[PDB]
Amino acid sequence: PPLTLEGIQDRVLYVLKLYDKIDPEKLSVNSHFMKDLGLDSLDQVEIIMAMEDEFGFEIPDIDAEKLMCPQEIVDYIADKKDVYE
Amino acid sequence: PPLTLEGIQDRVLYVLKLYDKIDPEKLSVNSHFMKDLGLDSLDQVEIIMAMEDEFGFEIPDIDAEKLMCPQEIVDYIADKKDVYE
Amino acid sequence: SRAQVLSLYRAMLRESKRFSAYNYRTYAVRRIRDAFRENKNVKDPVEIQTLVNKAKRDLGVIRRQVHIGQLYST
Amino acid sequence: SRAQVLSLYRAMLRESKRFSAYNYRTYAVRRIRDAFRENKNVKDPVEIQTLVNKAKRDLGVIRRQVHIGQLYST
Ligand SMILES: *P(=O)(O)OCC(C)(C)[C@@H](O)C(=O)NCCC(=O)NCCSC(=O)CCCCCCCCCCC
Ligand SMILES: *P(=O)(O)OCC(C)(C)[C@@H](O)C(=O)NCCC(=O)NCCSC(=O)CCCCCCCCCCC
Ligand SMILES: [Ca+2]
Ligand SMILES: [Ca+2]
Structure with missing residues (x-):
């Protein structure tokens, strides 16, 4: 199933x-x-x-070292997998 | 020099x-x-x-085949290089 | 099918870039472009499959030539 | 420096994942984690460099062991 912002955060x-x-x-x-x-x-x-x-x-490495809360991780995953909803 | 939307389009x-x-x-x-x-x-x-x-x-390939005008290319490059201004 | 032809076209041009000599990169690219274009308006489906099989085969030829070139390198 | 330690920490954990046997992946990970943590609050700068050099060396040991394991694989 295609990724969603809700699924990423969960x-x-x-x-x-x-x-x-x-x-x-x-x-x-x-x-x-x-x-x-x-x-x-x-x-x-x-x-x-x-x-x-x-x-x-x-x-x-340069990206990973910046992710210091769950929301930042969610935003990054959504970006890199091109998820908009 | 870091990439900008203006430089990408040019x-x-x-x-x-x-x-x-x-x-x-x-x-x-x-x-x-x-x-x-x-x-x-x-x-x-x-x-x-x-x-x-x-x-x-x-x-x-899946990404490249969708880019059929310059603006779509610009938007894609900016996305993949994380350029926002 | 359209998708298969364009995938092979891109793959062959990608391998062509891996030749070390400028003249041979341009030779391979020119040959690939002319060979695909000169068949653009072929309609006979079996003839299309035949040409697809040639692309599949020559993609192998290109990859083996790239490898041999790397062995003769410095 | 902080950046060097964390780069080596990540690199060693990455290589650890490449062992084929579950037990040895967990062995390598445990050893890496304990070895870096048990030195977290070292202050002596020359002692830090010494420990960094050990990480650099053992990253090589890990990479060679991974390669040898691949040769004994099926
Ligand atoms: P696009 O305009 O949407 O679509 C373009 C194509 C060609 C896909 C479309 O027009 C089409 O479907 N045409 C129908 C006929 C067809 O598919 N023609 C192409 C057949 S594939 C082909 O001709 C490959 C030939 C391989 C020769 C390789 C030579 C390599 C030389 C190597 C040198 C080292
Ligand atoms: P973070 O909390 O911002 O920073 C954490 C660190 C440790 C970087 C920070 O607290 C710090 O700078 N501490 C100062 C002391 C220091 O740098 N300690 C770590 C030295 S590096 C080290 O101890 C590596 C040891 C290598 C052993 C490898 C063992 C491998 C076993 C292989 C099995 C197959
Ligand atoms: Ca994106
Ligand atoms: Ca992006």
């Missing part, structure tokens, strides 16, 4: 709900991985690699 | 002004390669390959 958050270092009750679509969820940049590398696995494509 | 049109089959006086940013410029789909394959050379990256 799957991004699903991946994060399986990352065991995140407190489930602080996770929101605008939770900053560092300032809000208490993660570090080693965790962030792993999280973006998990997004690559979920959506089936690689994210260049 | 270079797209430049590539087309060097394609010798196009009548210079019909070429505009919204000229349809087939309906307006009298080209065919063999020409169109070559034109998009020339855009790949100009901008330094490959365009998948």
Whole structure:
């Protein structure tokens, strides 16, 4: 089934709900991985690699290092897969 | 120098002004390669390959086959190189 | 079919770019363009399939020549 | 520097994924994660360079092991 913004956001958050270092009750679509969820940049590398696995494509280093909340990930996936609704 | 929408459009049109089959006086940013410029789909394959050379990256077949006027090419390049102004 | 012809056209032109000598890149491109265009207005469907099979075959020839050229390189 | 450490961290985890056996993928990932984390709060700059050089070297070890595994594959 073709990707939608709703499906992208649901799957991004699903991946994060399986990352065991995140407190489930602080996770929101605008939770900053560092300032809000208490993660570090080693965790962030792993999280973006998990997004690559979920959506089936690689994210260049320069792009991956900028994605620090779920909404930024959603926006990026939607862009790179050309999803508009 | 970082890419801009103005630079993208100027270079797209430049590539087309060097394609010798196009009548210079019909070429505009919204000229349809087939309906307006009298080209065919063999020409169109070559034109998009020339855009790949100009901008330094490959365009998948499914994407390339849809680009049938300069503005569509400009919009695509800007998207794929993440250019917003 | 139209899609198959245009896919092979693009693939052959892509492989042509991989020749190291300018003269041979231009030779391959010219041959490809003339060969596809001179059959543009063929109508006989079986004749189309025959020409498609030739493109499939010559795409293999081009790829093998590219590889051999890489072996003779420096 | 921070950027170099994180680039090597990602590169090593990427290579780890290329092992064919599940158990060895998980072994490599666990070793990488523990090795980088257990040095997170090192401050001595020369000690940092030493650890960076180890990562550079072990990235080579990982790549060679991946290649040898591919040769023993079916
Ligand atoms: P992020 O929170 O913004 O930044 C995280 C880092 C670690 C970059 C940051 O906290 C930092 O700069 N810390 C300072 C100290 C430092 O850089 N520590 C890391 C040094 S690099 C290192 O320890 C690599 C060790 C290599 C071991 C590899 C083992 C591989 C095993 C292979 C099995 C097959
Ligand atoms: P577009 O205008 O929408 O469509 C263009 C085409 C040609 C697809 C369309 O007009 C069409 O369907 N035409 C019908 C006939 C047809 O399909 N003709 C083309 C047949 S394929 C062909 O002729 C390939 C010939 C292969 C020769 C290769 C030579 C390579 C030399 C190598 C040198 C090293
Ligand atoms: Ca896009
Ligand atoms: Ca984009």
